[PDB]
Symmetry: D2
Subunit: 454 residues, 4 copies
């Protein structure tokens, strides 16, 4: 044993599973708005010898020695992160050590707030994320609502947009210390200027969680939250198309009276919350951040917006309802209730024909078992060089699946009868098998980033 | 742009940096007890298309669809995790989603305890970890000391061992809800049975943090904490020689009928309470390493780790060095440099300049954290490069030369900053370091190195 | 020394001060809505040998022995408390050990809530009490907002009433565990039925803090909060006209599923929060509770309502504005801004002519230094057998003081110039001295409960 | 109805109950160390028109008006409070508004500490008070253990004294922000200087809860805790012989320039944080009692309290009784009945049936709280009735008879419930108790009694 044997030689069982997942990604239409396909260059840095280095601390302030190369990689990732978003190093710093997006948010809360301090974020069924302080009527679900006190702001159910007026009213009474401007399922742009006004009035910090839109912000195809936010967190996957990791952007310099974010943010990441950094992920992120500075990436992000708009119009022209009427970013929210179907049924039918989407709560749903919506995303297929006409062909495949689900629904009662009818009824299976073959044959023809077999 | 270009072609600046780190790992004597060299097979799974899949939830209970392959990989990693430690699936479950060791411990605290509940762990200067509840006299350092109430237990400075008597005394007064059995700088075995007795008396859960010794436990070369602990956390790197990730083991079944209620709370704390999407590429890399830990090869490796640590301990004693607790029973050695006339901060800097990486360590008794009087040395990393006993005796020879160079510089300098600058400024000293570095690097480059050839 | 010497013989310095305070109470017009004059019978029980008994625990469950007489007194106080409010002993219990009203509320929070649990109460400038969870924008002021998380509900600024709609909206988002229905400066009745609906929807307990109106509730001259509340707290002074102490009423029996308030409420009072009971206060309360069961007390409470209505109409007929337009209880809220004066100036002028009231925040005040209102109360002077015509004569004296303050205001700049002008200007002093003599000569003619000289 | 009717005329049921309690206090031997008999002068101020005045705030800084007389009374009570304990107004301030001793301690915690801050006090079975942070193994009892984090320190069972060594050991690990020096069942003096040394080392505030001994401190018959403590709380009843209320003393001025920041935080915690309107009738009654504590009469009383406690201690030792810590230095005596063959719960019930009120007390070593092995006896109450040494020797004679009656009943009964019923059922036993009660009540009625004549 030398430790230099290949995976295919030493673990055939695992190598086979890697190839099955690689084939599943190539043969299907990936429409989940949070997925993307990472480049081979970043994956090569992710599976590197940088996994073997413990570098607790920060560049120039390490606990162990022998960090001369790791220091340059982390400093390079910091520079490339500031360059990717056109930030002045005198006004902004960045922490590149968060393991993921959720650790990045919890580090910001730990740095700036005492336990049980108050935060406000968009409610989960309204498009927010779990780490924005989600708790039910019975249980504290997210740790952000356990160690801190959260109260959500909601959507205007008539416009499908954030109710900035009700947010301002409740913020005066709740007196939050930090407000989160960021979404996971929201097809419109956030009025960061209005969020800044609410934060300035109640004297709260403005955290921008741009995880879903970070790539579009880097390519300057949508307004940047850095103009108004005190803290900016993001994932490095999603629309940034990198390895799974997290980033924290914080203001530094003079506030009015200097800013005090830097020492607190860094101390919260380490030694408060995390252990040894994952230098292999940090390097893979630095690879992806460099790609985000090229004209290629701006062209890709522009195509993401165009492909999402094309998918929205193609759905409208076939008589589908869209939450908020349309889209201004990378995703679309489809209300299937006017068509007589729900998201739980559509998600299962589309999955059986190699089309991956996720059900989504719509403004008006009182049942979480069968949400009335569906969330569709452009960034993944756009990375396979999909164009507007390609996404209209995707809408054609989706409509076939929806129509099949409508006929299965009229022949079944509850959701369990619906799911089994798709597998048992040999007439529906043959119809699903034919649609799947046309989907997979169409999807396989496009290129795929990364390695060839895994 | 296809995303299929190589790193060397598309990002030469990063490709050069990866190669310099690979050269640094090959040419140096890595003696930090926390490190190991991961196999190429695990690294290939780490940098794969599994990075592209969101699979929030657990096998069979996923938020999104298209997780049929990911469900198999996570279930396979769970099966291999129980096999590697010889656990009965009817009595033990495992969660393979923690991002690292620190998230694994934090997930256990949030699962079992309310905010401000009481925790006891070994004090940090005594050999505990940050995530075991470290506070200073002026500030709460670890988040485990912010969201929860911690009180440390200490070593007996006479013997260098954990004072189990004083632990039982203070646990009766403090009444902790959870006691942590686990260390980062400790050369002896933990009396898990005595820890169990104390936990049973005060009705506390026993958490075993075996991150440093998990590889030795898998090879069954030291007693297993699974015989006494309620919860077992570990890193997947360190002595398990895998990719960086974490694991949580928990009992299930009948407790006394009276059942164990760990499974649902542990899994819920990881997701959706604390973490987001799992890192399936890391999970697969862990599954590869766990398979390797079941082979006879890994048992010979862990046995060699113990032999190499004992040989390094004996060779240090032959040269008039003193060891905390007088020796070692595991993978590391704690050296007390105070009788020799040097400190840990000075020796650490001298050894680093000759490509010998170690870390200074606090000794039982002192309190100066700027100039600790000790040094921590580990065997797992070099043993993975097929070092043997005679090779580690050779390593002590180089260390002995470095300590003597540091002793000469100490008598010519006053402060620590003057000591560090003298190693770079003095031309005679820099020449003695350069020749020692060349002999060290020539010695280290001859041994094999796991992973890829150039990155 | 035997310990049987009188106060006048052993401490002449203290006996003189007791007589000065007794004279000050007889010669002035006491209009503070929270004051009253306790009967001699209750004061005789208050200064009794019951001060000498430690009786930690509850009747039949004491820590020490020799509590046979104290057990009967506490049990008698419990019975008389239930009889004073017409409560079924099978549906209600009472704890008579709280030292005051504020300890009674904190005991309820400690019994029913974990630390940092959420409560809602009427905001302090809107008429609520400090113990209802008051915190400013800079500091947590009340301990109820330190150990627990409070968010206030407010008044509708246009009607001067509680905004029950905004309360229902914010309660759904804040998710409180306990809502407080009770006021310290509010001239209208509380819609306890609507409060019960809001509590039933968000699954919160309804606490009624009837300290100001407890006497009126016992005499059945206003609706009782016991029909809708889960917990009822009150002071024993104020309109109950007893010694200073507190009471906690709690539901017992079957809820739907038995109630679990009794064991938790009692345990919170002792041994959690308080030490040895004050048996001298408990007996003085039992004396006052017996008086509240007589037709005399119902006649007194009816006169309190009539005297407050008479003071309101007399103020209206002289061109004064009243918050919420009038009154339905024992107090009136006077808005002095339409008359060109504030509460800080009126309070000082009235105090100089032996008329005691307190300034009060009005709906619309942005300055707490000079509140625009004044709180006037009927229960104190009604205990001296004041009638409707007597209170109209009180309004005559107040109007003279207000008119004097208006002339001093036009001759001064800030509040400090106003206060000194009343003492320095020998023309204003002579005018204040003449009004004071007419006030004191009028007030001295009425009887006074309690002892004759102290 | 004028409100000027007497209690005997308007409420005969309550007037009869007051007279029965007055007769019970006159005819019994009150030996509960917590009690005293308040003078008539203080009781007259307690039941006065000061009950009618709302004066939220502090002198000069009141919410309402018409407080010119109330301001003088509160300021006079503050002046007399500093005079009674010989304090310099430049170095010490006092707050006279706490409703009782427990609110006084809670106000200090909320003033100086954040929620969940750490507190150390003497454990309840060891002689501490509930408000010092008492928890059980199953529940948080005191609110000081709910809003704050408490860990007890214990007695040395060998000597019955506070283990100052173990306190210093555990305080270094626990790191409390405040340490409480004060007891409810402790017969020896507290080494406040040693407590100060421990607080200085861990940077904690020293709170002296002198509620039981405040009268002895005012008369300067025992060392004063004001020489070492940062904050001093006390009840105004107990040995101060006043009405039931509380006091908070705090240092002011220069700490090391570095000033003391206690005054504004202490006053703010009392109002508006915790309490509402002050009880001015109680404040005036306290002011009367504080004036009495400055006279030579009160010094002779406190000296007689010490002599009477020593005489009761010597008389108990003459009759083969054992005392916790071997004696007493203050106002109370702790008797260990375990060598005598009885327990505290049985003796307490027998003594109560013959008009001798005491309370059972936990002894150092045992854990049965249902049947404690000890008894707490106090001298202040009977000393206020002009008892002398020979009178307390007579009191021990009655106690000795009761303990022997309880011993005979113990050999005829099995359980505690059978023991209690046998004292009422057995005709021979009830007759022996009735004759002992008549001799006790005849002895007690002959002594004077402070307060009013009939209520
Ligand atoms: Cl997402
Ligand atoms: Cl480590
Ligand atoms: Cl009030
Ligand atoms: Cl006591």
């Amino acid at each position: 044993w030398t430790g230099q044997e290949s995976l295919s030689d030493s673990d055939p069982e695992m190598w086979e599973l890697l190839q099955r997942e690689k084939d599943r990604q190539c043969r299907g239409l990936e429409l989940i708005a949070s997925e993307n396909f990472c480049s081979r260059a970043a994956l090569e840095a992710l599976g590197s010898c940088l996994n073997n280095k413990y570098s607790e601390g920060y560049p120039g302030k390490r606990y162990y020695g022998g960090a001369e190369v790791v220091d340059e990689i982390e400093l390079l990732c910091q520079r490339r992160a500031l360059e990717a978003f056109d930030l002045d190093p005198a006004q902004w710093g960045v922490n590149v050590q968060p393991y993921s997006g959720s650790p990045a948010n919890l580090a910001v809360y730990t740095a700036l707030l005492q336990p049980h301090d108050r935060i406000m974020g968009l409610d989960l069924p309204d498009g927010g994320h779990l780490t924005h302080g989600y708790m039910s009527d019975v249980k504290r679900i997210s740790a952000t609502s356990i160690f801190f006190e959260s109260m959500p702001y909601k959507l205007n159910p008539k416009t499908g947009l954030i109710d900035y007026n009700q947010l301002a009213l409740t913020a005066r009474l709740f007196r939050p210390r930090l407000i989160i401007a960021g979404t996971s399922a929201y097809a419109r742009l956030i009025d960061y200027a209005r969020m800044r006004e609410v934060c300035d009035e109640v004297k709260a910090h403005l955290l921008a969680d741009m995880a879903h839109i970070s790539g579009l912000v880097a390519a300057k195809v949508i307004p940047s939250p850095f103009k108004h936010a005190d803290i900016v967190t993001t994932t490095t996957h999603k629309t940034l198309r990198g390895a799974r990791s997290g980033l924290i952007f914080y203001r530094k310099g003079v506030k009015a009276i200097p800013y005090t974010f830097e020492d607190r943010i860094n101390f919260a990441v380490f030694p408060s919350l995390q252990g040894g950094p994952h230098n292999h992920a940090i390097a893979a992120v630095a690879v992806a951040l460099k790609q985000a500075c090229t004209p290629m990436f701006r062209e890709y992000s522009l195509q993401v917006l165009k492909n999402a708009r094309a998918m929205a119009d193609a759905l409208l022209e076939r008589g589908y309802s869209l939450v908020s009427g349309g889209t201004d970013n990378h995703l679309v929210l489809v209300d299937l209730r006017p068509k007589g179907l729900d998201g739980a049924r559509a998600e299962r039918v589309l999955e059986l024909v190699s089309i991956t989407a996720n059900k989504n709560t719509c403004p008006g749903d009182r049942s979480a078992i069968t949400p009335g919506g569906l969330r569709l995303g452009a960034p993944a297929l756009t990375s396979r060089q999909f164009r507007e006409d390609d996404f209209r062909r995707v809408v054609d495949f989706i409509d076939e699946g929806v129509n099949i689900g409508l006929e299965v629904k009229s022949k079944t009662a509850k959701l369990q009868d619906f799911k089994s009818f798709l597998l048992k009824d040999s007439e529906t299976s043959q119809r699903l098998a034919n649609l799947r073959q046309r989907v997979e044959q169409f999807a396989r023809a496009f290129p795929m980033p990364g390695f060839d077999e895994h």
